[PDB]
Symmetry: C2
Subunit: 346 residues, 2 copies
């Protein structure tokens, strides 16, 4: 199709390689160069994917065939890195949470407004064929009207976290798993049902050596009155689930998150079941759906909007709304009260 | 074994027959008589189970071979009926919620204290072989330490409830499904983890013609710090589930509540799955367990303590604690704040 969009990888940790393993399969993209502060990090990546490496950010931004940057740097560096790239006219892919502080999220919305570059903050779960199908079933009212949803994202990370790791520091990981795990489900929840109005959370450190929260249970009320539960837990074996309760039918989704990185087959390691009246008798029916390469398609969408125009699915505002849920939930714990999202956002 | 305990059925609605269908199978019990205000109601029951019928409560209480009463009258009549029977020296079985108002619950605790008769408030779910097994797994630490639990009890009752039915009136059904459905799971939760310390709830009428709440999501914090979620919903197909998250293993329980009344086989229409490390790999394993006739064994326990001494598993205080969760949750909705159980109880 179109001329492939030229991309540069910034931040060459683990997740940078998972991303490139998926996106370099695309005919829509061309990896041109990469940057890390560490020479060795640029060494390995550029050889692996066979692109250039740049000693300085300036050197990367000076390349005219770099149209888009793919930012996989630490959450607290998203803001300044996005500002530097957007002010050089580069379109922006940044990994999810947009940031961990409101200030930074606001800086990112502003510089994207200012510069007018394309922006995606990559929450890729909503792209899975299962989430797409669930969205269809809800929008068409196949399952009737939704009352509530229960979402869970857990793993045993907290159990092993020794005293000092960064995931144990509130400033870097607000609400513990609520940021690292919960933002995925927070995005799924507002994708499925629209914007959250208010939050209540109970949460605390459990079964851990770190000082951060490792277990949360969060209640949400939506702007339209619908409700949700989100459980985020760093103290148990891995679970990723979404239960949707409808007036005609319920949906029960489970994912084996261990196949997340294997992005073209992630959907095959999930199950979606519909519980419906067969009424005064119920039946549970398996729901099948096509797989979607969640990590590949999200980068490709930016390329599609650079070449063809339009907006990506998850802008700075939308991403900011996801972070705001996390901040409201932490605020809710400190202040022992429900918290309006407007209180956070404005 | 021992001389069978003589019992009288008071309140001869639907549930009275479900109860007798189970308990009259017992060698420990003898149904002697029954009372309802309506002659016809006493007509049908006494013929069905072949006992006496009494025109007046006094006439029933005058029988010396009535040792225990089985009270299946409306929740707001539990208190005066228990007081009249206990003051005539009869041991008490009463169906669950002990009552819907605190005042009444307090009257019942007091008259049982005063008279010293045996008392059981029948929350029979905890008696299921599945709940017994889950309790074992938690107490022995087979699943490691519990962080959180998610419990759900829903059905489509609200969808059909036309304007005027009693389930639509807050005073008779506080929090809607929270009373009728939730008290079961509230009892399961404190059976499994001990006493609740505080409650937060979001809830409202949804998809219904009645004025009551029909959808709740409730958060609980336990006196020991552990946490739980309870969803109660009258706007969707039936679900009864309990998910327990442990540091070594998770449990996922599902029950087909349609087999509740068929009490000797209820457990066969449930599934318990253990998710455990097989670590960095997980396996889901089916957990089997013996069935328990939940309705029969709960009545038999009262007979066992009348003949052999001791206390039943769920006294007036314990039952009152279950109601207090419901009242705290309604208070939480009105006052838009978390509510200490002590605030309700004392």
């Amino acid at each position: 199709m179109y001329n492939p969009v030229g991309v540069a990888a910034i931040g060459l940790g683990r997740w940078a390689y998972v991303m490139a393993d998926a996106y370099t399969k695309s005919e829509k993209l061309k990896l041109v160069t990469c940057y890390s502060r560490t020479e060795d990090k640029r060494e390995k990546f550029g050889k692996r994917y066979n692109c250039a490496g740049d000693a300085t950010m300036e050197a990367l931004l000076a390349r005219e065939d770099v149209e888009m940057v793919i930012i996989t740097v630490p959450n607290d560096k998203h803001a300044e890195v996005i500002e530097q790239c957007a002010r050089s006219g580069k379109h922006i892919y940044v990994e999810k949470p947009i940031s961990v502080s409101l200030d930074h999220a606001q800086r990112i919305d502003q510089v994207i407004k200012e510069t007018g570059v394309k922006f995606l903050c990559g929450h890729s779960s909503r792209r899975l064929g299962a989430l797409r199908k669930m969205k269809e079933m809800i929008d068409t009212k196949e399952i009737g009207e939704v009352s509530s949803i229960e979402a869970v994202f857990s793993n045993e990370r907290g159990l092993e976290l020794k005293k000092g790791n960064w995931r144990g520091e509130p400033a870097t990981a607000p609400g513990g798993p609520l940021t690292q795990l919960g933002v995925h489900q927070i995005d799924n929840l507002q994708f499925l049902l629209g914007p959250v109005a208010r939050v209540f959370n109970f949460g605390k450190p459990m079964y851990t050596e770190v000082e951060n929260i490792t277990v949360n249970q969060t209640l949400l009320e939506f702007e339209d009155g619908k409700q949700a539960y989100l459980g985020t837990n760093w103290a148990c074996p891995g679970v990723f689930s979404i239960n949707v309760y409808g007036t005609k039918a319920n949906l029960f989704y489970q994912l084996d998150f261990s196949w997340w990185s294997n992005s073209d087959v992630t959907d095959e390691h999930s199950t979606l079941i519909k519980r419906e009246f067969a009424n005064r008798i119920l039946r549970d029916v398996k729901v099948d759906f096509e797989s979607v390469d969640h990590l590949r398609v999200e980068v490709e969408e930016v390329a599609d909007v650079i070449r063809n125009g339009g907006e990506t699915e998850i802008g700075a505002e939308a991403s900011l709304r996801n972070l705001a849920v996390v901040l409201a939930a932490v605020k809710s714990v400190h202040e022992k009260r429900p918290v309006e999202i407007a209180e956070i956002i404005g």
